[PDB]
Amino acid sequence: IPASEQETLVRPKPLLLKLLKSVGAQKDTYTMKEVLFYLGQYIMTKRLYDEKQQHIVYCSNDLLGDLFGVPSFSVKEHRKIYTMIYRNLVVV
């Protein structure tokens, strides 16, 4: 994952926007660096990720699960994460 991908501008779909607004100000367009930070913040504040449970995020009991279509995922599989995130946004 090139660092250039983080500058990419995107517009979250309704569900993802609903998630993002619980941790950050609503915007029409976000850079991927913002989307990833806010998503990562949403995960930590809701403790869907216990750093003690070996890099796996558990989201079957959260909207995040409905967004990503999975019950859990590793914080280390970044390409998979990006694909799941793209399913929920539209590139500018």
Ligand SMILES: CC[C@@H]([C@H](C)O)N1C(=O)[C@@](C)(CC(=O)O)C[C@H](c2cccc(Cl)c2)[C@H]1c1ccc(Cl)cc1
């Ligand atoms: C939820 C944990 C979060 C913390 C806040 O930085 N996080 C990590 O813990 C990491 C250090 C896990 C790792 O690769 O070892 C980085 C991770 C991340 C950062 C930028 C892009 C991606 Cl796809 C993942 C990143 C992350 C960000 C968003 C999601 Cl959806 C998942 C993981």
